[PDB]
Ligand SMILES: [Zn+2]
Ligand SMILES: [Zn+2]
């Protein structure tokens with residue numbers, strides 16, 4: 001039900017904003033991805 | 047990196063025979079050339095399609111998230 | 112009966128070894144070409160990606176899917192999306208499929224084409240069923256995945272033919288051959304000492320009498336008899352691929368006679 | 378096929394022959410100034426300066442980046458960034474004028490000096506076309 | 512006892528964790544074997 005960022009190994013929908021630094025709830029590794037977008041995307045079948 | 051569906055050259059389907067093929071080896075302990083003829087791959091165009099291919103995917107999966 | 116007769120030799124569920132006789136090469140081939148890239152068939156022609164955490168990237172899979180042979184014996188009664196007045200696909204011109212997979216098994220989860228789910232109204236007519244000929248019964252491994260690797264798709268089959276993209280053609284390979292004992296000399300055999308030995312002899316030779324040295328060269332001879340063998344992917348029983356071919360063609364030659372008339376009025 | 382150039386069967390091109398993936402990847406950081414003045418990753422619009430880009434910012438989220446699924450193309454923006462100057466001058470980064478494709482993976486990280494660090498990766502698929510070399 | 516600069520080490524050398532590590536062990540590191 002809604003999300004933002006992600007643990008690069010201990011992948012756990014995190015999410016945050018301004019000045020909240022950039023770590024993870026435990027697994028320090030300040031890397032973080034950003035998981036897809038809800039809006040569907042279409043592709044060609046060829 | 048995942049068997050290919052159908053043989054680029056002629057087109058016949060192929061993507062299913064993977065496990066079937068990779069099986070007539072480890073289990074039925076056979077020699078490639080014979081296994082293929084047994085999977086219906088008669089011509090080299092398709093024949094080659096399988097014989098070659100490398101399932102890198104498997105090594106990909108072994109990763110993580 | 113009247114003209115171009117046939118004598119089917121070996122013949123099964125996927126192959127049609129047949130001796131098509133008394134015709135013109137031209138035609139023999141014409142047909143061949145048709146059977147190859149002009150026989151309509153259905154296949155996934157669009158993919159709405161909801162969620163993919165696999166290794167393979169979107170379009171990659173997208174692509175794969177296209178190829179996945181789909182049922183289509185009742186394709187002649189499912190208008191071409193570019194005609195189904197509906198703005199962008201009606202049930203009257205396109206099936207719709209789905210695919211959902213999850214990494215439950217703590218041990219590699221294979222996503223085959225059997226996992227495809229039809230969602231629109233088939234209107235009761237063989238169509239859009241992921242063809243399967245597998246022994247186990249799960250044809251076409253579409254993709255694999257680990258732990259929490261998710262995959263949610265939306266496939267939209269449509270008409271279309273090889274000419275417009277191979278993923279359609281129901282051909283897959285067609286044998287063709289004639290004059291096995293090169294009597295018309297339509298070829299000059301390349302050799303080193305003696306063609307005869309060096310150049311293999313095709314099985315088809317038996318079905319036609321050999322040379323007989325001394326005899327001069329037959330110049331009026333033309334080409335009847337064509338040893339053809341039509342294979343099939345399955346989206347149509349081999350036989351139709353032969354028939355529907357003989358038809359589409361037949362139909363084309365008509366559109367010309369037809370067009371000539373729509374032109375005789377002015 | 379004449380003089381060093383071949384005829385490649387299209388049919389097989391379609392059946393997947395010689396298809397290639399291609400990933401590129403832009404990158405930016407929030408430059409800092411000892412006298413406390415920091416850039417930022419936002420989705421600006423007019424408001425004094427005017428100095429932006431022609432690109433369509435409308436593909437950005439609120440953190441100044443795009444998200445995977447997205448389908449970038451022309452000169453669309455890919456990263457939103459602003460520098461406070463004495464106040465809205467852009468430092469955003471467009472997708473290379475001649476490319477186009479799909480974002481594929483992004484990532485924000487900290488850079489020693491505690492700066493925001495991002496690396497956007499846009500993937501495209503290329504199919505054996507005529508001009509192509511083999 | 513005293514800090515004196517940083518020596519950019521070479522991967523797979525003696526000081527790179529990769530030297531000792533094993534197949535599986537690696538993948539968890541994301542470093543292609
Ligand atoms: Zn973490
Ligand atoms: Zn083949």
Ligand SMILES: [Zn+2]
Pocket residue numbers: 192194195196197198199200201202203204
């Ligand atoms: Zn319609």
